[PDB]
C-alpha cells in the first residue's frame, strides 16, 4: 500500500532489500504466463539476473539511496507484471550476457 517511511539504519535497508528480492522471486511465475517465456528462458536465469543487479548495486552504504533503489525496482517490477511494457523489452534487459581495446576504439572513431 503506502510508501514505507524512510529507513534509519543499514539493517532495515537490508531487510527491505531481501523483502523486495523475495517479492520479485514470487513474481517470476506470473511473467512466464503473461508473456510467452515458457520455451524461452529457464526459471533460474531471471533469478540470477535480479541477483546480479542487486549485487552490482551492493556498494551503496546510504540507507536513503538503498530505499530509493528498492522503490524504483518495485516500480519496475509492477510495470513488468502489468502488460504495460512490450515483450522484447524484458528479454532485451533481463538476459544474462583480439588485439587491444584501445586499438579497436582507435579504428572505430576518434571519440572514445
Amino acid at each position: 500500500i503506502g510508501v514505507p517511511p524512510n529507513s534509519a539504519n543499514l539493517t532495515e535497508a537490508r531487510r527491505r532489500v531481501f523483502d523486495f528480492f523475495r517479492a520479485a522471486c514470487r513474481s517470476i511465475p506470473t511473467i512466464m504466463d503473461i508473456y510467452n517465456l515458457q520455451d524461452v528462458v529457464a526459471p533460474s536465469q531471471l533469478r540470477y539476473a535480479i541477483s546480479a543487479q542487486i549485487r552490482n548495486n551492493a556498494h551503496i552504504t546510504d540507507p536513503k539511496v538503498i530505499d530509493l533503489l528498492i522503490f524504483k525496482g518495485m516500480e519496475e517490477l509492477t510495470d513488468i507484471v502489468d502488460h504495460a511494457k512490450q515483450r522484447h523489452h524484458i528479454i532485451g534487459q533481463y538476459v544474462v550476457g583480439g588485439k587491444t581495446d584501445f586499438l579497436k576504439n582507435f579504428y572505430t572513431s576518434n571519440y572514445f
Binding site: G2, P5, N6, L68, E76, H88
Partner: protein
C-alpha cells in the same frame, strides 16, 4: 479574509516551531515549513474556524541545483469561505521522503504522482506512487534542470523486429540555444 489579516492571525495562532519563514506581500502570503511539520500545518489550516482552507489547488516542485536541498515543493491553497489564498512551501533533496497529504486533501494523489514523476520526490503513505505522465519504462525525471530537453532515447518503428522500438536519441537538427542575456542587466 485578506493578506493583512491572515498574516497576523497565523502569526499569533500557529505554533511557532512549524513555520520558519513568512512573507506578506501582494504576490502572495507564503509559509515555509520543515518537511516534518507540513502535514501538521495543513491539517491545522484545514480545520481551524478562522482559517478554513478546504481546497488544495495544486502541488508543484521547483528545481534549484545550486541549493543543498535541491527541490522546493509548493502547496497552493484556497479558502472558499474567506476568499483567500495561502501558499505553503517546503524543501527536499533527491533522497528524502516527505509526508503525503492525500489523507487531508483526496485530490493530492495525482499532483503527488506528477511531482514524483517529474522531479523524483517520494511521498510517505501515498496509496500508489507510480509515474502518471511519462512513458512506460521511462528512466529519469524530465523536469529536473540537469535533464536534457530532448531526453536520452528516441522512438521509431523497426520493420524487421515488427514492433515500435526505443533507440538512443540522434537529432537531425540539434536544438539551437540562443544566448540573449545582456551584460548591462
Amino acid at each position: 479574509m485578506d493578506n493583512q489579516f491572515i498574516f497576523k492571525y497565523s502569526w499569533e495562532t500557529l505554533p511557532k516551531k512549524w513555520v520558519k519563514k513568512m512573507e506578506r506581500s501582494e504576490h502572495g502570503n507564503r509559509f515555509d515549513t520543515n518537511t516534518d511539520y507540513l502535514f501538521q500545518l495543513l491539517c491545522f489550516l484545514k480545520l481551524h474556524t478562522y482559517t478554513r482552507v478546504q481546497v488544495l489547488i495544486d502541488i508543484c516542485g521547483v528545481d534549484y541545483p545550486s541549493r543543498k536541498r535541491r527541490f522546493e515543493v509548493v502547496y497552493n491553497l484556497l479558502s472558499t469561505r474567506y476568499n483567500s489564498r495561502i501558499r505553503v512551501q517546503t524543501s527536499a533533496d533527491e533522497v528524502t521522503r516527505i509526508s503525503s497529504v492525500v489523507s487531508l486533501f483526496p485530490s493530492a494523489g495525482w499532483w503527488e504522482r506528477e511531482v514524483w514523476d517529474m522531479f523524483g520526490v517520494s511521498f510517505i503513505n501515498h496509496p500508489d506512487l507510480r509515474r502518471i505522465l511519462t512513458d512506460y519504462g521511462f528512466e529519469g525525471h524530465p523536469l529536473r534542470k540537469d535533464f536534457p530537453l530532448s531526453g536520452y532515447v528516441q522512438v521509431r518503428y523497426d520493420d524487421p523486429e515488427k514492433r515500435v522500438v526505443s533507440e538512443p536519441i540522434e537529432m537531425t537538427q540539434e536544438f539551437r540555444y540562443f544566448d540573449f542575456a545582456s551584460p548591462w542587466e
